Copies of this chain bind each other. A is one copy, B any other.
């Protein structure tokens, strides 16, 4: 049901965007068609949990037919603002990582006649489409200024996160736009504290706080909740998401490549913070190569350091913190707090 409405508002948003390009930007149908395909490929095919969260939050805050009809439709449009924003970051981050595929289709910039030259701009369009849809559908809403400001702020936040991700490669002290660096990692930046900072800004704001905020706004309920507790829940849930991902990447789509990719994962930083000198040097020697001997070594080390045990203890401490915060929130905001529970239930030990 939520999904049906969601996908219906997709077509209605697509329609508006494509027509406007025709009527107002003089666009011919060859180019309109290219952008339709870019839009579909970049925005469709995931689970839409970010966007669906907005719907679910708006449904729980509803407390004569047609306020409900409008609030839910607003929720769907906000939901798609988040999905298109995410698509924007994926397209740009894939180019930035020189990644290869996504869903098990190719990275957008890797399609045969999309080019790195076109794809960068395609990203820019995807993010402008968030503004254009907000400005069209919410032209007359009193929350429009506030929505744009909060959205802009999360946008910025996410680009900042991507800065931290991008500069996790080498000693921050040698950071200089005039002076090359080896694209061997250092590991100098592979600390828990840096990892937590990357995840928080790159990921937790847009994935967990923004959908909750948007559901609040379109329900006109934002002042009714404790925003400090709400952010804290978002940051914790968001962090747990990525750590859960990082672990499953190693120890469970088809199978993941963070080790080969030499990623700053929870595993790597947690391993480095507890390991012996000998373990460290063997890590450094084996990490970040496709070679299936080098990989297997890294997994072995991860296994000897009992990282899965550490994971299980981290998970349970997060759960108990999440649970206390949800109860603080339920004191004043019982409907909002249930929606957060439900969000947490779609993250905790996956699904």
Contacts and interface: CB of A to CB of B under 8 A. Distances in A.
Q: What does DSSP make chain A's interface, helix, strand, loop or mixed?
A: helix
Interface residues of A, number: 62
B97 A117 contact: yes
A30 interface: yes
A83 interface: no
Contact of A163 (B31, B132, B148): B31
Contact of A25 (B98, B157, B179): B157
A145 B112 CA distance: 41
A124 B159 contact: yes
A122 to B, nearest CB: 8
Interface stretch (A60-68, A71-79, A168-176, A320-328): A168-176
A229 interface: no
B120 A181 contact: no
Nearest to A121: B162
Nearest to A148: B148
A144 interface: yes
A296 interface: no
A131 interface: yes
B135 A177 contact: no
Contacts of A108: 177
Interface in A158-209: 159-160, 162-164, 166-167, 172-173, 175-181, 197, 201
A33 interface: yes
7 contacts: A30-B173, A96-B120, A112-B178, A113-B177, A117-B166, A121-B162, A135-B153
Across the A-B interface, the 6 shortest Cβ-Cβ residue pairs: A128-B156, A30-B172, A131-B152, A145-B145, A112-B180, A124-B159
